[PDB]
Design a binder for this molecule. Structure first.
Ligand SMILES: OCCC/C(=C(\c1ccc(O)cc1)c1ccc(C2CCN(C3CC3)CC2)cc1)c1ccccc1
Length: 222
């Protein structure tokens, strides 16, 4: 598959959390570590997205729209995938892994348990790298931004990625004629826990103890 193949190649290189053992552990250390990690990943996502066929020919405003609705889905799906071969831990990066006890120390228990629900589902499906990268692309195209101007063009991007996934499954998973549909039926859980995650920003902001960038605060309030 042309599209699956280029997506495999466009997969970004590992990113490291670079946590510092001289800062005493705390919910604040954990959360600001996750913020720096995520902003470096967001920068990688923009370069990555220009390898999605059709994405870079949308208007500036449409590209912003799609990415504004999908970035947390893309981030979480990466964490999900990196944890497939672990048990009840979330692999944020090779050097930043969270078990149940550290989730609680960070205030992220309920959120991380929701994510581990996704890990569990994809584990039993034996999710392949090929499927993960096409799912990531589909999460972007299917973001359901309310702002899109060129609805016809985004519908076409979803169809091209949808077609790539189905084609891949038709060839590599003939023992399951409905595997592509099973993959797509995990997307509602993905969007569910991105909304849970974005909503958590507001808890953190209200409590006021963890420092946030002033641009982020402005975005949150708006
Ligand atoms: O438990 C799972 C959720 C972890 C997590 C993550 C996270 C997810 C995946 C990943 O790979 C790395 C990190 C997170 C944290 C900070 C941001 C920032 C805010 C600041 N940025 C603006 C400056 C531009 C925008 C991004 C983005 C994501 C999170 C999310 C909400 C509350 C608390 C923790």
């Amino acid at each position: 598959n042309k599209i699956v193949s280029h997506l495999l190649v466009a997969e970004p290189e590992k990113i490291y959390a670079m946590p510092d053992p001289t800062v005493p552990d705390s919910d604040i250390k954990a959360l600001t570590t996750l913020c720096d990690l995520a902003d470096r990943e967001l920068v990688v996502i923009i370069g990555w997205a220009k390898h999605i066929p059709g994405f870079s020919t949308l208007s500036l405003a449409d590209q912003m729209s799609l990415l504004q609705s999908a970035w947390m889905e893309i981030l979480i799906l990466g964490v999900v995938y990196r944890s497939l071969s672990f048990e009840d831990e979330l692999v944020y990066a090779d050097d930043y892994i969270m078990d149940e006890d550290q989730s609680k120390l960070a205030g992220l228990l309920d959120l991380n348990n929701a994510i581990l629900q996704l890990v569990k589902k994809y584990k039993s499906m034996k999710l392949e790298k090929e499927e993960f990268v096409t799912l990531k692309a589909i999460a972007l195209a299917n973001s359901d931004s309310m702002h899109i101007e060129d609805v016809e063009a985004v519908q076409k991007l979803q169809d091209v990625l949808h077609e790539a996934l189905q084609d891949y499954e038709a060839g590599q998973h003939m023992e399951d004629p409905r595997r592509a549909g099973k993959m797509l039926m995990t997307l509602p859980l993905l969007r569910q826990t991105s909304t849970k995650a974005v909503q958590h920003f507001y808890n953190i902001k209200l409590e006021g103890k963890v420092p946030m960038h002033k641009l982020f605060l402005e975005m949150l309030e708006a």
